[PDB]
Design a protein around this ligand. Sequence first.
Ligand SMILES: O=C(NC1CCCC1)[C@@H]1CCCCOc2cccc(c2)C[C@H](N2CCCC2=O)C(=O)N[C@@H](CCN2CCOCC2)C(=O)N1
Ligand SMILES: O=C(NC1CCCC1)[C@@H]1CCCCOc2cccc(c2)C[C@H](N2CCCC2=O)C(=O)N[C@@H](CCN2CCOCC2)C(=O)N1
Lengths: 242, 241, 211, 239, 233, 195, 236, 210
Amino acid sequence: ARRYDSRTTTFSPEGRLYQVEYALEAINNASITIGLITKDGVILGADKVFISKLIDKANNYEKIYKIDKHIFCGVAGLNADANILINQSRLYAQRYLYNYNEVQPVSQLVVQICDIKQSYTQYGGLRPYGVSFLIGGYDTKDGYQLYHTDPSGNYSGWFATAIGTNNLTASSVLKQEWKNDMTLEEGLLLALKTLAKSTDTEIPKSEKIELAYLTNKDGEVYQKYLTEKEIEELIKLYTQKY
Amino acid sequence: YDRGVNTFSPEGRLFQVEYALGAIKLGSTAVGICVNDGVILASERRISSTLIEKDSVEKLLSIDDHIGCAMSGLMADARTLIDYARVECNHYKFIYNENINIKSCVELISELALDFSNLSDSKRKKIMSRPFGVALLIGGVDKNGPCLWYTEPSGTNTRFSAASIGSAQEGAELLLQENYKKDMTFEQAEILALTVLRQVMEDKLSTSNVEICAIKKSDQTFYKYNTDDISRIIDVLPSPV
Amino acid sequence: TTTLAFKFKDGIIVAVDSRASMGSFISSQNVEKIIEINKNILGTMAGGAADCLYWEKYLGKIIKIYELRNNEKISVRAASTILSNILYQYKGYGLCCGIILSGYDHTGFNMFYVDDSGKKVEGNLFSCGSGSTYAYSILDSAYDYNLNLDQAVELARNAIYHATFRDGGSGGKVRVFHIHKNGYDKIIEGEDVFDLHYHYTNPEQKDQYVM
Amino acid sequence: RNLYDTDNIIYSPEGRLYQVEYASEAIKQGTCAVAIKSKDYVVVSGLKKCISKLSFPQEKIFKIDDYIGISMSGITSDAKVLTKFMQNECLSHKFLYNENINIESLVRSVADKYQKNTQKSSKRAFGVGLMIAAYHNEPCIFETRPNGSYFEYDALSFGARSHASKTYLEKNLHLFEECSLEELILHCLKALKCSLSSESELTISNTALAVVGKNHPWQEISSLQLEEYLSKVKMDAEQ
Amino acid sequence: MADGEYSFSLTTFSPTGKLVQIEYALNRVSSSSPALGIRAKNGVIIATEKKSPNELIEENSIFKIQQISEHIGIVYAGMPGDFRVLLKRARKEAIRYSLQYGSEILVKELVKIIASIVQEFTQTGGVRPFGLSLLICGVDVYGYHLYQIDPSGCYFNWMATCVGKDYQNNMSFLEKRYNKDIEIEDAIHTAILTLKESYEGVLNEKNIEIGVAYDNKPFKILTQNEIKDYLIE
Amino acid sequence: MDTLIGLRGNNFVVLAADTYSINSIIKLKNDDNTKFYDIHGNKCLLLGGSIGDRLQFGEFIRKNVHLYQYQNNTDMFVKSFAFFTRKNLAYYLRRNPFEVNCLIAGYDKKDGYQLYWCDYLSNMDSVNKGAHGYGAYLVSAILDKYYHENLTVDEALDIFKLCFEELKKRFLLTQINYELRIMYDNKVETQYVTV
Amino acid sequence: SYDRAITVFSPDGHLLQVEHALEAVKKGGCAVAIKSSNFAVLAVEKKNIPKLQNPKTTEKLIKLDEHNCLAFAGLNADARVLVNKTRLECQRYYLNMDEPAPVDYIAKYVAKVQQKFTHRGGVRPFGIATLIAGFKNNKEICIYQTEPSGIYAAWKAQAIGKNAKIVQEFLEKNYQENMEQKDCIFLALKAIFEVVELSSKNVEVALLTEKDLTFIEEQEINSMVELIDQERTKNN
Amino acid sequence: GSIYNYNGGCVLGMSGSNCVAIACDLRLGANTFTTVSTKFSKIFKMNNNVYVGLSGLATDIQTLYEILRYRVNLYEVRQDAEMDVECFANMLSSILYSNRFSPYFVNPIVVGFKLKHYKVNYEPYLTAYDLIGAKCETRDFVVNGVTSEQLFGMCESLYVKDQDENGLFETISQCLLSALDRDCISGWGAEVLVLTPEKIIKKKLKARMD
Ligand SMILES: O=C(NC1CCCC1)[C@@H]1CCCCOc2cccc(c2)C[C@H](N2CCCC2=O)C(=O)N[C@@H](CCN2CCOCC2)C(=O)N1
Ligand SMILES: O=C(NC1CCCC1)[C@@H]1CCCCOc2cccc(c2)C[C@H](N2CCCC2=O)C(=O)N[C@@H](CCN2CCOCC2)C(=O)N1
């Protein structure tokens, strides 16, 4: 039966892990997911992949997910693998709350999920998870945070970043336009700009945009998942400003 | 690769064991000499640079008070085997209140080395997934007097009066065969060991690139050689012609 | 049983009696209640004979393995921690162990008391066994850190003697070992307390002493 | 490429298990051993492999129990695992039943240990053969193979160039039954010598010899007795 | 076997990043008898093509539309044995939820649990993916739902959809005549018309199964006579 | 019995204990050091009960909290530390209980100076003042009577001195040797008191 | 549970998985550790996208316990898992001995873990090499270097990761004993910049003493970088 | 039995018209007679429509509250909605029974609103439990704790159907205070939470402190 083993967790002649490279190719083939930090909160935006006009576009976010009250993620890659890992990370946040009676710092949650991914790359004979996460949140220790994870269990903090297809264009737009002290509105307009420019267009379309942000206001951390109407308002504002 | 670890070749040899045999041919050369008054182990150290601390690296480890060991091949595997031997020798000493015979230590080491074969589930289960790729010289003094034993990845243990391991195994063995004598005294054993090492060492013999230990029959205590002892030996060496 | 140890200016004195009992019957008067854990650490046995012997020899094995593996001498504190953890793992099982670990290491002279309940107490003067209150009273009454070796040995002997005099569980011989920087010496291998009584309390030997 | 000799659980189109056959092939590479028996005695003789001039000869025969000993050919570590198993089975039988184990039952247990290592892809066959000599109501010699089969013999030999010893044994098989212990020892030693290399001899160093019989617990022969026997063999070989 | 060294993934990544086993399961689904579901104003309908191979087979013995609990129904396109296993698991999870929380399992929760079960079989060692797609319809406090579950374990929220044979053309036919404000009768007629346009020949009360959940009522599988009435027009 | 006392003010928290190590009817030591468990990051666990259980539970808590702080390169919040301690004690309560009473103190910017009172059953609450042991019966009313918010550190130490005098005078075990941990102004100080 | 032997002997007698892990290590950033009388300096290359990536998040130079630190080269995720195992072992040692773990003990433990991961079915080796600076039980400062095969040694100064040969040869002819803290920091900066672009933001530097681990400030690094640029231009 | 006397404490739930109230004493006892705390609330907010009152052994109170918070948070993040009060009540019953033979020594009550979504109607919801999860759904009042008999007498005598928020507050506060005044091991303060669909009013009563 060894003749059927594909040897997923085996080093390649160049110290590379081929399954991880292929999972990264799959992630690079997914729709764009962006994130950026303002002084008013973390913004996550995403392009929706069209399937049919019959999909139920009401209260159906499929690329941005709530992990906890103070944490939320964007997904790039295989959606079912992402669903598994999102369930796991929700469990991890609640476990930290159970054990310590306080909400989990964002970096600790990112570390736990990235450990899951690394373990799949090192132990066993199973394929890795084909998902990259943009995890953003707030906690008193480190303020507003934004992280990027890849299948290898790697991660890193960012002030703005993009994953998925054509992340180069979106990243260049963010590098040119992201500033160190932006307001929520400015952040949302910049997110709309980078989404529009990565999708090869000029005016973005509400039907294809998921936008959410996470603010710590008056002491409560609160997450807003913009509807098609709010996104339409922002699209009008963007077409005014450009 | 294509094969499994436990595969026989058409000539009835385990492929993995044979490949492991090709790994023991590497590393610094060590020589063991066992005469009636005590066993002596000598080894060259291949210091890689001036930045490496000589104290850290060492090819002559003590397994028990009365047992020393020289090693060759993969050093991490050798250290694993040596740690296991230390634990087992001390367990024997605890449950029997006496020093373990050297041959018994060699047997324990050889069984640990062959654990990868998965031949039987008795006592612990299989954990090692491959041979160790290590050859050892284990000398010591037990109730039967001094003795020098050799173990290798195939699990065969052989007793010698003098032996050699490492890169210059063959030249050192040639020098030992034609010079060793059974009635040699200890000082002559030291002279022979350092002469052989100097003859086969790429570098020039000196107190810093040679390590020595001996288990004398008088006290059955493994003893490491400091600089004065090595200098004393080096002085009485013959000419390098 | 009476064991004791104390620090003084030249090191550590360790003294014990040598009686072993099965109930009220004296099983032996030549048992050895000081056990060399290693070249620089001595252990004393109080309580269950099998428990003390087994777990102190087991500690000796552990320490031998440690000192081979790490090419250095273990500390008395580490040895006591290992022993206390091992014993605590048997809590509720009914082990009877009263142990004093004394030795020299790179932090100087050290002394710990370890019992089966997991207790681990650093200190400079300990006593264990049925006779330990008597040894304590004698030592505290006449203890000075600046005693010389002869005075320290004499005090240890006298304390053991008084313990064996008042305690039916202690007797036989007094052994007084001296721990110093380069190991330990047996100052008094074993001296019958019989002579000690007619030396200290009733030297006249002309009538029965009256408590 | 055979395409059928890679795994130990795969039959070839001819119905053969190649990995097990290779394990057997390992047996032919070992040093020669000879076992023969009279009506009261079994004598085992074998050549002790010597690695080099400064090396001590390898051990060829081993005591299992008071009246049981073995010789092996093949992978030494395998033989050691089997030796430990047999010694433990015998001692455990004495411990439980206060009697010496039945030799047939022990050999069957050994053969079942052999067999169990041939049915799973995660195992390999023991690459060693065991020659077993005991006295249990009668002298007996057994052989065990890597495939899990065992056989009883009246005279037996295996190892490198054991066909010459087998020729000698077949020739004189009729004699062994009625010959004395001294004669039986001479026969075993001569059969072993028949397997020697051209330049080699039989010396106290390189020759292992054990006897076991009716009132004769398994016992290796001492250097003095061994030397006298070897001298007698040489002298009556000159004839 | 199921443990030890013999537990390695049979679905692995290709150089382009695709998991071809999932694609092949998808092809297997796309070759199966069509199924579809429609979310109407006050109910949700799931309908399927059940073409009897021979006059000997008993139609009632084969139901491609099953009830998971009160108010939740399920239909599949693909391999029937896989469907049986997943239907048993879905019923088990419904009752597990019901035992914990007393009330009936919310459709979304069931769909997520089943999708995770499906996903496991694309990653765990020694197995193939499930070769089917599921349509799960139901009614709960939060309205009417129609969900699809793919062999990969992804799930989609639909107003109306079709899986199985030539589902692109069926999808165009269904999207040409679906509004969010249809009624139960209009939805059933639309489902029947879609299946007719797909099925080659003439449909009947024996060639189709239909299941409804409407007006806050328990899930119901239309009998032969009810479908016959729907087919009279 | 081991007497433990804790008092938190707006600007400080003070813990205090007797310094006796007891083996049956004799004092092994008059300067016990197995009660206070200083924890990196302005935290302190004070324990009473059997010495063996004290050592085991306290060193376990200290090591786990240090591990957390090294792994996450940050200081654990005092409240998180208190509830981690309580939860571990409650885990072992129904399996192999640690018969230990705890006072948990610390400072952090989020909550200021905090004091938690936890008993051997892992009943815990945050308090302004608390005590454990039989001497709690004799110090609790003094704590109540003389405590007020805005108390200064010197005033709190005078309150503790009142408590120590009462323990020496009226408690069956005449405790006269004490050790105090004072946390205030971003520094932890140790004091020893004889009455 | 997967149990296949991933690391096996090639016909040549090599553990090819170990050499591939070594390749991974050679793909990592450079790290340098220099020893002194009672302190060590550790430096490591930094890679960070300007104005978008956060520099404070990625940590190649980390603290194991009270007195031991670690730098590593190779796969970051492997490094994180190994580092967390090492911190756990540090605390376990403290619990079992009532003393903090010495540096040599921790180096031996890390090497044991790596060797073990070359010798167990169903796992691949760690693709990391590590530099471990800390104090022995005699309070002496030591630096150990471990590798994916599990072999370790103590060094007066060592570099790991990409282009480590150039840094090693540079350190051989420039390292002295008992250098002052300023000069040791400068030597570490020169060693790291022998193979990495000259810039303050391309290197992170820390200093290890008995007290604690202290990272050298940005302005100090920039001043030392200007000194290096001046010496380079003047040498050309 | 005596385990429940170790700490003391009690909880009380009451409903009015479009309002519901939950009240508890504030004492943390020890050894049945020593008061160690006077701010130990037995009332916990699961979500805006679900409160739980936990009397009994304080360690078990805290442990069970943490378990319930974990479960509710997981359920609500997965579902993206607030947990219905009845689902929560059944879940609490199942959690308590899962420890049927080594139970948590707790005497819970659940108080909140059952939402009937048409506009939304808010129906008061009350349930009292035993330690193994047996449930008592009620419309007027629920009680639990060592003070149960006194609370039962006060409620049976004083409860008035369909009271507005102020009448509800006065009634539940009087019931709690009168019951507490007859208990040696309960009291030392009372917190009263009066719930409406629009606001929550939290009050601390000037109660007896002996
Ligand atoms: O003197 C003693 N301690 C001193 C002497 C050395 C160290 C200090 C103790 C004094 C009482 C110890 C109580 O804790 C126990 C723990 C476990 C078991 C038992 C007792 C019961 C056991 N019993 C009772 C009758 C049958 C039997 O097995 C038993 O009392 N054993 C004797 C051993 C006496 N000798 C045995 C051989 O020779 C050396 C010593 C024994 O432990 N005495
Ligand atoms: O973080 C955890 N798991 C990590 C540790 C390993 C990997 C992950 C979970 C957290 C899950 C939270 C869900 O809510 C509960 C579910 C079931 C039971 C209980 C609570 C109550 C139970 N209680 C409360 C006090 C007495 C007792 O038994 C209890 O807390 N169980 C602990 C296990 C504790 N041990 C686990 C290993 O570590 C040492 C301690 C437990 O479930 N932890």
